Amino acid sequence: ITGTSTVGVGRGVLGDQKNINTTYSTYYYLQDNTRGNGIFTYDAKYRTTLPGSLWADADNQFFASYDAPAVDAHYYAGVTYDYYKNVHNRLSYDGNNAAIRSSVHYSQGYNNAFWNGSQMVYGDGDGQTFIPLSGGIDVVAHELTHAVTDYTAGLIYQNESGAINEAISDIFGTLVEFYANKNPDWEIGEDVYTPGISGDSLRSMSDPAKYGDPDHYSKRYTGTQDNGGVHINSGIINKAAYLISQGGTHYGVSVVGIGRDKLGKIFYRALTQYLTPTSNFSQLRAAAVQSATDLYGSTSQEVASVKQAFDAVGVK
Ligand SMILES: N[C@@H](CCCC[NH3+])C(=O)O
Ligand SMILES: [Ca+2]
Ligand SMILES: [Ca+2]
Ligand SMILES: [Ca+2]
Ligand SMILES: [Ca+2]
Ligand SMILES: [Kr]
Ligand SMILES: [Kr]
Ligand SMILES: [Zn+2]
Ligand SMILES: [Zn+2]
């Protein structure tokens, strides 16, 4: 909507206070004009029609429980925009400052979130398995990273290319979590998963096997569940990315860590310059090796560590 840029204040899903960029025209809308062509947050009002209504508020204060998922979807979309712009020189998900749209309160008791090809969508959870999923910055950044992937490599969402697609979203969801630097970790969704249980998460990058996901190519899932296991076999690539950043010895193979920033540079370059819609794990290894070679040189430690990491998870 056309109006003047304002700054509201509210509380997110975890009860933290934060300022949000809004737009005033009769009401205060969750419309941030400070980032590209805008960040827009919508109310789906417990239904499944999308996007729903641009979020309107009478007084620019967002402290109601009903407000919290909107506050966080809006705010963490901003953080994710800032990450891609400041760290990778990328302007929104299409690289040309496309408007970022999110809907919250999708359906009833909906234990998931997704990118639907056009926008981010967040359930409220059922209060047992999940609380509202926009409360997790790694979740928000995971979903928006699907938009980035769709505009760049375009990895098909099935089998190995789908597992790479998923891992890219977990990798950059995690790097955005570290960028924001509030209790960051290498786990996925811990802030919104199972409020009755402390210390768990939906997936682990540091130890995918903790939640039954493979950490080696030899344990890859080859059935048809989950689009050929895209959220399962992602553990193999997530482990490799973890090893590249943090180092470690895995099934006897030692990897020298090169840190998060270099992990991010290598995988961002692979994603945007080398991966294609049909890339498999072997081709991801080649893309990462070539990316690391471009950035640091063929005889660099960075290239050596990429190779060790993929060796360690059985991807040749
Ligand atoms: N996002 C993943 C994990 C489940 C989250 C909610 N059931 C999926 O759709 O498979
Ligand atoms: Ca209000
Ligand atoms: Ca965390
Ligand atoms: Ca996390
Ligand atoms: Ca939990
Ligand atoms: Kr934007
Ligand atoms: Kr983005
Ligand atoms: Zn997903
Ligand atoms: Zn995903």
Question: Do 135 and 72 touch, CB atoms closer than 8 A?
Answer: yes
Q: How many other CB atoms sit within 10 Å of the CB of residue 127?
A: 12
Distance of CA 310 to the CA centre of its chain: 22
Decide: 238 in ligand 7 pocket, CB within 6 A. Answer: no
Q: List strand residue ranges (DSSP E) for 150-265, in order.
A: 187-188, 203-204, 248-250, 253-255
Decide: 81 in ligand 7 pocket, CB within 6 A. Answer: yes
C-alpha span between 15 and 111 (Å, rounded): 20
Q: List strand residue ranges (DSSP E) for the chain, in order.
A: 4-11, 17-25, 27-29, 31-32, 39-43, 53-54, 56-57, 61-62, 100-106, 113-115, 120-123, 187-188, 203-204, 248-250, 253-255
Q: Is 125 exposed, middle or buried (0-12, 13-18, 19+ CB in 10 A)?
A: buried
Mark the residues whose beta carbon lies below 5 A from ion ligand 5.
193-194, 197, 200
Domains belonging to the chain, first-starting first, are 6-154 (3.10.170.10), 155-315 (1.10.390.10)
Buried b (16+ CB within 10 A) or exposed e, 143-171: bbbbbbbbbbbebbbebbbbbbbbbbbbb
**Closest of 79, 14, 15, 77 to residue 42, by C-alpha:** 77
This structure was determined by: X-ray
Q: Is 216 a catalytic residue?
A: no
Side-chain half-sphere exposure of 304, counting CA atoms within 13 A: 10
**How many Å from the N-terminal Cα to the C-terminal Cα in the chain?**
51
What is the distance in A from the centroid of ligand 5 to the CA of 287?
35
Decide: 227 in ligand 1 pocket, CB within 6 A. Answer: no
Helix axis angle, 234-246 relative to 159-180, nearest 10°?
40
Question: Do 104 and 170 touch, CB atoms closer than 8 A?
Answer: no
Question: Do 279 and 161 touch, CB atoms closer than 8 A?
Answer: yes
The active-site residue, picked from 143, 160, 250, 302, is 143
C-alpha span between 91 and 203 (Å, rounded): 29
What is the distance in A from the centroid of ligand 9 to the CA of 213?
15
Decide: 231 in ligand 1 pocket, CB within 6 A. Answer: yes
What is the distance in A from the centroid of ligand 8 to the CA of 166?
7
Ligand that comes closest to the CA of residue 201: 5
Task: Give residue for tokens 């919290």.
Answer: 68
Q: Is 105 a catalytic residue?
A: no
Ligand that comes closest to the CA of residue 30: 2
For the chain, the C-alpha Rg in angstroms (whole number) is 19
C-alpha span between 24 and 1 (Å, rounded): 9
Decide: 97 in ligand 6 pocket, CB within 6 A. Answer: yes
Q: Tell me if 194 is assigned to a ligand binding site.
A: yes
Nearest alpha carbon, ligand 6 atom 1? 36
C-alpha span between 103 and 299 (Å, rounded): 47
Q: Is 206 exposed, middle or buried (0-12, 13-18, 19+ CB in 10 A)?
A: middle
Q: Which atom of ligand 1 is nearest to the CA of 130?
A: 6
C-alpha span between 212 and 110 (Å, rounded): 23
What is the distance in A from the centroid of ligand 3 to the CA of 182?
7
Q: Is 315 exposed, middle or buried (0-12, 13-18, 19+ CB in 10 A)?
A: buried
Q: How many other CB atoms sit within 10 Å of the CB of residue 63?
A: 11
